[PDB]
Amino acid sequence: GSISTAVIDAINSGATLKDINAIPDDMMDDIYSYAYDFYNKGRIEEAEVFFRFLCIYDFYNVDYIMGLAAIYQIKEQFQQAADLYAVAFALGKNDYTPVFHTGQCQLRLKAPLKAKECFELVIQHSNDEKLKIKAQSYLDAI
Amino acid sequence: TLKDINAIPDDMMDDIYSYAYDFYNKGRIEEAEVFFRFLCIYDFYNVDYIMGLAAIYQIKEQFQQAADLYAVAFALGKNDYTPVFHTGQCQLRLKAPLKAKECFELVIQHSNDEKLKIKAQSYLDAIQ
Ligand SMILES: Fc1ccc(C2=NNC3=NCCN3C2)cc1F
Ligand SMILES: [Cl-]
Ligand SMILES: [Cl-]
Ligand SMILES: [Mg+2]
């Protein structure tokens, strides 16, 4: 998957496609928009390929990671989704949306203590009042 | 992964990790790097294996490579902010002090590791 690719790239430490500027920003932006065209039409399998392609080129991009994580959550691949949401959070320190979704995934993974920690982080640190209500509704049910 | 098919026994993998750390502690960086690369090929999803290779890259002043691995290590472990602390150090070396500040702030806001937070605060205090 995307994470294994990132680690292999790191182990081998060779020239990556991004390191050589193999695809310009404008083209990457276009491909990202195409990925969501597929996604928005329910063509989740094509969208997944396009987001995997984006994540091979530039894994450390919050927008690419969040798109792929969303697909895995929809497909009920909850551990892969949680792992990617956690990457997205590390890259995007100030957005607690990936932490909220990690909590949802942890609940489906039968890990309520991890989920509780996620939802509590949202309540204590997010400035998104609507996200906080949603996190509290999950907390109330745990 | 090779771990998924149990290609090497568990006890032998523990030995190899301990040998990797022995090389690391003795300053035998080239050998530790081989051993941590071996471990990460065997199980890319082992946070401690990733952290070891990331540490080697940081010592070698390959700061971006280290930060990239620390991001994966953080994600897999979810609740351990040690990789975030080391990323902050890497960002300082990469002349990205605002990114470093965000890393150290994240450690202090989320971590339950008091000794780690003391270290993070000492870096924050020094950031201009
Ligand atoms: F906690 C972390 C926060 C950011 C990063 C990062 N690593 N690598 C990286 N490449 C482009 C942006 N970016 C941030 C790693 C962490 F471990
Ligand atoms: Cl937020
Ligand atoms: Cl900066
Ligand atoms: Mg608040």
Swiss-Prot record, chain A:
One Gene Ontology cellular component annotation held by this UniProt entry: cytoplasm
Primary site of residence: cytoplasm
InterPro entries per record: T3SS_Ca_resp_chp_LcrH/SycD (IPR005415), T3SS_Ca_resp_chp_LcrH/SycD_sub (IPR016379), TPR-3 (IPR011716), TPR-like_helical_dom_sf (IPR011990)
Keyword list, A-Z: Chaperone, Cytoplasm, Plasmid, Virulence
Gene Ontology molecular function terms on file: identical protein binding
Compartment(s) of residence: Cytoplasm
Pfam family, one: TPR_3
Family of this protein: Belongs to the LcrH/SycD chaperone family.
Function of the protein: Assists the correct folding of nascent IpaB. Once it is bound to IpaB, it binds to IpaC and impedes their premature association that would lead to their degradation in the absence of IpcG.
Protein name in UniProt: Chaperone protein IpgC
Name of the gene encoding the protein in the UniProt record: ipgC
